[model samples]
Target: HMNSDGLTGLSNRRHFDEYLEMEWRRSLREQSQLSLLMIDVDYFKSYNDTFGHVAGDEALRQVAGAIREGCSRSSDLAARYGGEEFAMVLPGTSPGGARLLAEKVRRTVESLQISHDQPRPGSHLTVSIGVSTLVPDGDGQTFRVLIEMADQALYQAKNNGRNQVGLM
Candidate 1:
């Protein structure tokens, strides 16, 4: 209950933290790769300003659905990181796999074609994703490092332009 997001029905940040720690430990033990995707809805505040809160909530729900659809693996955990940000944790996945899924997630959200009156020419809702993968060594690197890397990548994506995937 507390681990779930009220709007999207996806796991909340609390669950994300718990799951990431557990997966980090497991990956450390097995020396397997773990991946994360930091996703943000593009121009969401503009959408909210144009469409109002109810519609914004609906758009978020649809975006969350697309994310859920992309993460089909049982080991993949998707959560609402905060506000319009979302995260996906992939245990036992390689960097290549994570990138592939991140692209798919981007496309899936684009395919939704949710209308927005933003200044962008397309006028459709979209997402920007940041992907990070690591094989935990149980040494100096902490799970927070992975998050920082992904967050940096996400910043790069938004900086380069919205609606694309960035790797770190």
Candidate 2:
């Protein structure tokens, strides 16, 4: 569930973390490709500091809309990961396809043309994304591994400068 402003209905991070674990096990047992995307709105803090919370909320809504559009596939899951950050789960998708989809979402958000005076390294109000793909092996694999990988890649994306996609 999402609020009118499109924030997750969940009250806290615990709920999202539990859901992620559940989805991870399901994907592994089903032998489906599980892709986790960590998305961040570049320069979001500055945007809020500069424009006020109301304007920031509007920007979040726009970003969420773009992400939802990119994740229309039946097997896809899009959720507000946290403040100015989002997560997507794509089942039965190859790594390359997941990367393409992530790139599409990034582009869609960019197309919105919102501005943050402190633009992310490359562009204004753009997205920084990290994607991790797991092709389930017969042996059990923990979801945490996948998330950690994506998190690492996300840091790399941010470190390499924002507004780009990094796939693991």
Candidate 3:
């Protein structure tokens, strides 16, 4: 079904989208913080080239499990946003809380020590995380704004360097 991703066994994009709006409205009424963490592998294409898609997919699966472990709160959705990309949708969590979890997830993936098999930079696999936190108002326009902020943070993280958490 559309509820799950067959590869990683995490929530599919549709599921994340459906739930995001639900959570968005819930948080709007509750006046609580909602956070998003956008995660991507560093130098993933190089890693796949060094190894192969077979190994690359395995690495993605491992990363997915690590993300689930890191964002274990009942209110959080550890989901696959796209190929080699994951998202954590956290309801009722503050900026600091989300950032702290993002760092832990980053560290955990690094600790996986997947051995990059690529040249230069980090010798092992690592993940970069972009975090955004906001208290939603009833204004419909603000929903996608949160996603933009998280994505911008992710862009900054990649631009600065990989394997670090960027906040916005």
Candidate 4:
């Protein structure tokens, strides 16, 4: 139960930090590409405010399941980074491939069709994903840089529109 989110049954931030650090180091030594995706639920506050806490919890659980489904490889580490936010660590993944995966996750979440009756009927839940890929070709950059890039990309995705993927 430790390092796991009891509600969603996903890895929590504690495990995420350690996993990212380990992968980042290995990628540097192996001269491979490392990618990270930051994901956030769109209008999560609004959803919780109107839908009640039980519905909100169930919605997040479904979202987590869909996210887990999107990461096809066993090497991909998907974790709940924060409340209504998630992170994916993709080891040995190329930039284009990472972005493609991010896009797929975004589409899958939208396809879930989770009701969002915050304003009215007919709206569905969605997620914004940010992808950052880097080749640590000489062991110069730190893992923190990757986090920053993913963070920036995530902000761009939110600014552009929800239910989309941004790359950096």
TM-score of each: 0.94, 0.84, 0.93, 0.92
What is residue 13's positional error in candidate 4, in angstroms? 0.5
lDDT of 2 by residue, 21-118 (tens): 76677877787778888888988988899889999988888888888887767766677778888888777778888889989999999899896677
Between candidates 3 and 4, which one is better according to TM-score?
A: 3
lDDT for position 95 in model 3: 91
2 against 4, candidate with superior lDDT: 4
- Best-to-worst lDDT order: 1, 3, 4, 2
In model 2, where do residues sit more than 4 Å from their true spots? 1-19, 120-123, 137-141
Residue pairs of candidate 3 with colliding backbone atoms: none
Top TM-score model: 1
What lDDT score goes with residue 114 in model 2?
Answer: 90
Question: In terms of TM-score, which candidate is stronger, 1 or 2?
Answer: 1
Residue 88 miss distance in model 4 (angstroms): 0.5
Candidate 1 Cα misplacement greater than 4 A, ranges: 139-141
How far residue 81's Cα lies from its native spot in candidate 1, in Å, is 0.5
**Tens digits of per-residue lDDT for model 4, 1-168:** 488888887789989888888888888888788999999999999999988899998989989988887677888888999999999999988888898888888888888899886335787999998899987644444787898899899999898967788888
- Candidate 3 wrongly placed segments (more than 4 Å): 117-122, 138-141
Best by lDDT: 1
Judged by lDDT against the true structure, how good is candidate 2? 0.78
Checking candidate 4 for backbone clashes, the offending pairs are: none
Q: Write the per-residue lDDT of candidate 3 for residues 108-147, one digit (tens) a residue.
A: 9998999975447559898989999999975654678778
